[PDB]
Structure 1
Amino acid sequence: EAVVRLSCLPAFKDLIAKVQADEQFGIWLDSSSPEQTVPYLWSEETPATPIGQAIHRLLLIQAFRPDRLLAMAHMFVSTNLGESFMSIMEQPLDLTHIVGTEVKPNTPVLMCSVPGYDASGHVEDLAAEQNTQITSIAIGSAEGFNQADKAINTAVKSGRWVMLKNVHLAPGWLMQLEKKLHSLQPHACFRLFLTMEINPKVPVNLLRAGRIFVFEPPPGVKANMLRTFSSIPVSRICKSPNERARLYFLLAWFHAIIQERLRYAPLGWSKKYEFGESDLRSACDTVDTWLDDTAKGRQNISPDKIPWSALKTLMAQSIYGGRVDNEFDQRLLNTFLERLFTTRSFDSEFKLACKVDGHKDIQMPDGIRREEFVQWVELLPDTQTPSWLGLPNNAERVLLTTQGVDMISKMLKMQAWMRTLHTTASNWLHLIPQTLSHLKRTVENIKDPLFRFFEREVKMGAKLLQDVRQDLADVVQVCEGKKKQTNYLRTLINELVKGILPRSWSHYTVPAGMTVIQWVSDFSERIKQLQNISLAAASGGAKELKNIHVCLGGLFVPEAYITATRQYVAQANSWSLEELCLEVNVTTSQGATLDACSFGVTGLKLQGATCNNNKLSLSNAISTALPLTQLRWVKQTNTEKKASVVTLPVYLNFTRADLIFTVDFEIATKEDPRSFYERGVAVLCT
């Protein structure tokens, strides 16, 4: 599809023959850095400037292997605005010159940090090297306001500097501080620092009137572990039985994992949990208390006598688990805790992470004191793949892809409308089907649950389709100015021109940050499916509804479809709903015959694994489409599931925010369910 879209450009009209003729394009696709060597594919009558070559290679990278786009993006700038443009940004921020010159005493210096980080260290160390004192003040308390007032008055009278930490808690007083600072400040050496967290409650005027400095925690497991070890005082680690030190290292390692997995929000943690410093401190206190309770004396205690169950339960249900809501994230956290916190962790053959880079393993250090663990932390290689955290290595690629499109969106967010609005609305009207009617509500065969469910679907779909078509016709009529324009239509046209889907159009669940074009395309697909449903119901009746390969992604409420299927299976053979359990069988044939209990579902996409003969196996490639899924409802036999099955969730869209149901899949004998749990294998409706 990307090649088809790109070939619309006149310079890429012969892209198809070019890609077919070339034989090194296949190996180029799988190269680690395709952006470094982009094959000459565009057709141009005259040689192009290096900027034009960069543009064409950027387009090709957007077409083939979009994950490297950001990297290619860098190259483009380096080929246009000069090399080493961002080189100064990589170098650590030398803001001593910024506080010396380029910053007036009137302008405050704001130090905004990503939540979970502190910025006072840099300014404090520069004060130490520049031998100027600062009256550091916390603004949490009520006396903090007056204390800051007297301190800033004294320093502006004398010529010293002031600090104000966590000023995001006092927005109105921050506005008052801006108003006060707008007055002339007699001294020139006076500098006001506002250490702060990135939070939208703060005044816009203060941000405009000051120099902002954004501070981030450096990515990397090594960096996070070093920060954790630096935060914890040495005396706490080097105290009590020596095993405590090792335990702390384990905790630190664990923390790093469950923090670095956060950057891969959809694949690895579902949501963006906090998992901040407070949870780490609580876990440290729990470990300290339980080690003190179990081992009364200072003597070393055997690894098997460590209260492993206490630590695991407390850090799975109280700390790090309180903010976890859905079952599967809790299961992943339990898997991590059981893998790490065990009596095996004190052996020399313990593996903190396996399968890293295919064959390499992160061997657990053989240490007893804090210093050896710190040295092992400092010796970690820089080449940290996501396989360290347990995720498949391609996840990073996916992440880059995401960043890529986000970047494009920003470029779109930062760039006579009647003609284009007309052409888009007319194209949508030609694309969106005209009308589907409620061919339903027959007195006979009302008892069929599928009939009622499809009645509700067809009703609300036709209703929302009529609403959308009416709004689009109104926009069409107004774009020529053939009729008046109202407030509702004003909001609709503003939301359309800004590219955000109208709120009055979203009557069903939608992925966050979805463009109107994708929304109307999915609308067309859903309307086509519902029209097919209505045609089948008209041709055959209620019986034909069962033998339909309905896609769950198109359906607006798939859980209602599952409920209706369960009711249909229960009604036939006269069973009750509690006794019916769901069994999934993956059939290769798209039109394989169904028995009295099998219902076909298409469009289900498996991520992180491949299925064959209803057996799963781990694979690097994502989005392995399932040919056809037969959902069967069989009478529950009241047996314990074998250890060779996994309970995989079925999310609805790629943003794993809403759960539809769960599927019991049998895995290959080589793998283990824990690896499935940690890699975030899942089924998606869309």
Structure 2
Amino acid sequence: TPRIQGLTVEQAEAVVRLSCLPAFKDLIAKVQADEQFGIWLDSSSPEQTVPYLWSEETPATPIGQAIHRLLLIQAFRPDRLLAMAHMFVSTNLGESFMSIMEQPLDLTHIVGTEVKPNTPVLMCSVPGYDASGHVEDLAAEQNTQITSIAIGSAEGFNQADKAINTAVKSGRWVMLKNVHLAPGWLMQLEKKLHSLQPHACFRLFLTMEINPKVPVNLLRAGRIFVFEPPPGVKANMLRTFSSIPVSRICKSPNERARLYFLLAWFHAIIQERLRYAPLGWSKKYEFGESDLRSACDTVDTWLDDTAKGRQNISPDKIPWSALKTLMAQSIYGGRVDNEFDQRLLNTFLERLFTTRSFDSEFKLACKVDGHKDIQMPDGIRREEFVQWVELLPDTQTPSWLGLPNNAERVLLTTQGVDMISKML
């Protein structure tokens, strides 16, 4: 592994890792002859501007050029490997091959026609996301009665059996909540379903969170439907503001809405900071909806005790140290194991939760991309806050979190080496 100027040791190792094939015998010579090679290495999207580095004697096919680009990128810039696998499959299978999935999933016709009656609609949902909105939208759009139930008891078992016996003849779209908590009942449902003769309009939605306790034969005979919470600080804040009711945030005093906005921003920034582990947190915790609910109850009761029904209080009147200590030691620092992670949560709360965050000068996230800054909306109402989070920029660098801007890059290169291993 030599030290090529402009190439890292890993890049030279990957050059050796591909250099057993006659397309790139003199790839070191080609790279050292390419003057704009460093500029291309610094490019934001190098896939569309791959320089001519493959050497051959014949006019190569577009698939050959695409795989030459893939070879060179795994040599040099492995971060863009997933996006150029996207355009590589676009090269040899059409650009509209995956254009349905870089697009919100059209569930309606697919579940109405492409799903067998005897194959239940496996309603997979990652924890933290609830997909009952989709089945409610479907039920509203066909305008028929739907029995959405929660399976958590023997009475729930009996009602589920009665509803299944009704729906197997009525042809109904029936959703069964949190079925992953009863693996034995799920096994019973599957082994009955394999012998069932369902209606041509009857399908079962099995809303589950990711657990390895599910029946493998149900996964055999199931129409899997995996969703995710859409990535984005904006998406997390909109989800938080959709879950939080309007009355609770509009209730007096008028700084309660600002405190809830601070809570939503903090929860969104930590939850988005989970997905860039290990640099965000040293391990993946579960900052969930119950954690947000505990935080909301804490701030609600402490602000109620402080204000005692006052329609306005001073920015210095708010128990900032009380909320800081409750967050860091009981709400979100309880699951924190390492003291380094505890200190990190403390520094988040020191920056965010303070009395200095009620003026126009303060910034929610300093040095976004080194030059831009984000400032709080000065409105005092939930409508103004939700308008500010609607009108946020679509771009979201890791400096929004506080991670350096190359956090997305290191996540991409870890995803690329995982792509290599998973396809191996």
TM-score range, shorter chain: over 0.9
SS of equivalent to 1:28: helix
Q: Aligned partners of 2:298 and 2:276: how far apart in 1?
A: 28
Identity level (%): 100
Q: 1:186 to 1:260 in 2, by over 3 A?
A: closer
Deviation at residue 372 of structure 1 after TM alignment: 0.4
SS of alignment partner, residue 303 of structure 1: coil
Report if aligned partners of 2:139, 2:173 keep a CA contact under 8 Å in 1: no
Q: Closer, same or farther in 2 for the Cα pair 1:200/1:407, shift >3 Å?
A: same
Q: Tell me which structure has the larger Cα radius of gyration.
A: 1
Alignment of 1:61-460 (within 5 A): 61-185=73-197, 187-412=199-424
Find the counterpart in structure 2 of residue 56 from structure 1. 68
Specify whether residues 35 and 186 from structure 1 end up closer, same or farther in structure 2 by C-alpha distance, changes over 3 A only: closer
Q: Deviations over 1:54-80 (max 9, x none)?
A: 011101000111111111211111111
Contact 1:106 1:184 in 2 (8 A): yes
CA contact (8 A) 1:290 1:307 kept: yes
Offset from partner CA, 1:353-390 (integer Å, 9 cap, x none): 11112200011111101000000000111111111000
Tell me if the contact between 1:240 and 1:292 (Cα under 8 Å) persists in the aligned partners: no
- List, as ranges, runs of 4+ consecutive aligned residues in structure 1 with deviation greater than 6 Å: none
| Alpha-carbon offset, residue 247 of structure 1 | 0.3
Specify which of 15, 32, 36 is matched with residue 27 of structure 2: 15
Shift of 1:125: 1.1
Q: Is the 8 A contact 1:350 1:363 kept in 2?
A: yes
> Separation in 2 of the partners of 1:364 and 1:153?
55
Alpha-carbon offset, residue 297 of structure 1:
1.4
Once the two structures are superposed, residues 387-417 of structure 1 have per-residue CA deviations (whole angstroms, 9 ceiling, x without a partner) of 10001001110000000011111111xxxxx
After superposition, the C-alpha distances for 1:184-231 in whole angstroms (9 at most, x for unaligned) are 335322222111111110101112112110010000000000000000
Shift of 1:233: 1.0
Q: For residue 43 of structure 1, report the CA deviation from its aligned partner.
A: 1.6
The answer to whether the Cα contact below 8 Å between 1:162 and 1:192 also exists between their aligned partners in 2 is yes
Q: 1:312 to 1:186 in 2, by over 3 A?
A: closer
Secondary structure of the corresponding residue to residue 355 of structure 1: strand
- Structure 1 residues without counterparts, runs of 5 or longer: 413-686
User: Secondary structure of the residue that 1:43 maps to in structure 2?
Assistant: coil
Instruction: Give the superposition deviation at 1:34.
Output: 1.1
Tell me the alpha carbon deviations over residues 561-583 of structure 1, each in whole angstroms, 9 at most, x when there is no partner: xxxxxxxxxxxxxxxxxxxxxxx
Paired positions, count: 412
Offset at residue 39 of structure 1 (A): 0.8
* Cα distance in 1, alignment partners of residues 293 and 350 from structure 2: 20
- In 1, are the aligned partners of 2:118 and 2:198 still within 8 Å (CA)? no
Cα 1:44–1:174, aligned 2, differ >3 Å: closer, same or farther? same
The CA distance in 1 between the partners of 2:137 and 2:17, in whole Å, is 54
> Whole-Å Cα distance in 2 between the matches of residues 323 and 237 of structure 1?
27
- Given that 2:180 and 2:214 are in contact with CA atoms closer than 8 Å, whether structure 1 keeps it comes out as yes
Counterpart contact for 1:312–1:341, Cα < 8 Å: yes
What's the Cα RMSD here?
1.1
Alpha-carbon deviations, 1:516-556, whole Å to 9, x = none?
Answer: xxxxxxxxxxxxxxxxxxxxxxxxxxxxxxxxxxxxxxxxx
TM-score, length-scaled by structure 1? 0.59
Distance 1:31 1:184 in 2: 57
- How big is the shift at 1:252? 0.2
| Shift in CA distance, 199/186, structure 1 to aligned 2, threshold 3 Å | closer
Distance 1:18 1:316 in 2: 55
> Which stretch of the first structure deviates more once superposed, 7-16 or 58-67?
7-16
| 1:535 counterpart residue number | none
The whole-number CA distance in structure 1 between the counterparts of 2:311 and 2:81 is 57
Q: Secondary structure at the match of 1:388?
A: coil
Residues 99 and 75 of structure 1: is their aligned pair in 2 closer, same or farther, counting only changes over 3 Å? closer
Distance in 2 (alpha carbons) for counterparts of 1:61 and 1:121: 41
Q: Tell me how far apart the structure 2 counterparts of residues 298 and 130 of structure 1 sit (CA, whole Å).
A: 49
Local SS of the residue matching 1:113:
coil
| Residue 33 of structure 1, CA deviation | 1.0
Question: Which segment is superposed worse, 400-409 or 75-84?
Answer: 75-84
CA distance in 2: counterparts of 1:322 and 1:37, whole angstroms: 48
Question: What secondary structure does 1:93 align onto?
Answer: coil
Distance 2:105 2:45 in 1: 29
Decide which of 21, 43, 50 is 1:31's aligned counterpart.
43
What are the superposed Cα offsets for residues 341-363 of structure 1, whole Å, 9 maximum, x if unpaired?
11111111110011112200011
| Partner secondary structure for residue 296 of structure 2 | helix
Kept in 2, the 8 Å contact 1:110–1:195? The answer is yes
Three-state SS of the structure 1 residue aligned to 2:147 is: strand
8 Å CA contact retained: 2:363, 2:376: yes
Q: Secondary structure at the match of 1:214?
A: coil
TM-score by length of 2: 0.95
Inter-partner Cα distance in structure 1 for 2:330 and 2:228: 28
Distance 1:122 1:5 in 2: 47
Q: 1:5 to 1:370 in 2, by over 3 A?
A: same
CA-to-aligned-CA distance 1:109-161 (integer Å, 9 cap, x gap)? 11111111111111111111110221111012232111100111112233333
Task: Check whether the contact 2:121–2:223 (CA below 8 A) recurs between aligned residues.
Answer: yes
Counterparts in 2 of 1:16 and 1:159: CA distance versus 1, 3 Å: closer
Alpha-carbon deviation of 1:278? 0.9
* In 1: Cα distance, 2:120 partner to 2:269 partner: 37
CA deviation after TM superposition for structure 1 residue 16, in Å: 1.4
Map 1:555-574 → 2, pairs under 5 A = none
Label 1:161 to 1:6 Cα distance change in 2 as closer, same or farther (>3 A): closer
1-side partners of 2:310 and 2:153: how far apart? 40
Q: Are 1:308 and 1:341, in contact at CA under 8 Å, matched by a contact in 2?
A: yes
TM superposition shift of 1:37: 0.8
Give unmatched runs, 5+ long, in structure 2.
1-12
Displacement of 1:46 in angstroms is 1.6
Any conservation in 1 of the 2:151–2:179 contact (CA below 8 Å)?
yes
Shift of 1:94: 1.7
Q: Secondary structure at the match of 1:373?
A: helix
The CA distance in 1 between the partners of 2:139 and 2:25, in whole Å, is 61
Query: 2 CA distance for matches of 1:91 and 1:33?
Result: 21
Deviates more, 1:106-115 or 1:2-11: 2-11
- Evaluate the alpha carbon distance shift between residue 329 and residue 186 of structure 1 in structure 2; reply closer, same or farther with a 3 A threshold: closer
Secondary structure of 1:105's match? coil
> Within 2, Cα distance between the matches of 1:215 and 1:18?
44
C-alpha offsets along residues 456-489 of structure 1, whole Å, 9 cap, x if unaligned? Answer: xxxxxxxxxxxxxxxxxxxxxxxxxxxxxxxxxx
Q: Which moved more, 1:142-151 or 1:370-379?
A: 142-151
- Structure having greater relative contact order (Cα 8 Å, sep ≥ 6): 2
Contact 2:135 2:175 (C-alpha < 8 Å) held by counterparts: no
Supply the distance in 2 between the matched residues of 1:88 and 1:74 (Cα, whole angstroms). 12
How far apart in 2 are the matches of 1:30 and 1:158?
Answer: 61
Query: Judging changes above 3 Å, is the alpha-carbon distance between structure 1 residues 158 and 314 closer, same or farther for their aligned structure 2 residues?
Result: same
The C-alpha deviation readout for 1:8-36, integer Å capped at 9, x for no partner, is: 32211111111111211011111111111
Deviates more, 1:360-369 or 1:189-198: 189-198
| Cα distance in 1 between the residues matched to 2:386 and 2:294 | 22
Relative distance call for 1:75 and 1:159 in structure 2 (3 A) is: closer
Structure 1 residue 105: Cα displacement:
2.1
Q: CA deviation at 1:249?
A: 0.4
> d(CA) in 1 for partners of 2:281 and 2:171?
50
Output the CA distance in 2 between the equivalents of 1:3 and 1:103.
47
C-alpha displacement of 1:179: 1.5
Closer, same or farther in 2 for the Cα pair 1:243/1:132, shift >3 Å? same
Does the 8 A contact of 1:315 with 1:321 survive in 2?
yes
Maintained 8 Å contact 1:303/1:343: yes
- Give the secondary-structure state (helix, strand or coil) at the position aligned to 2:208: strand
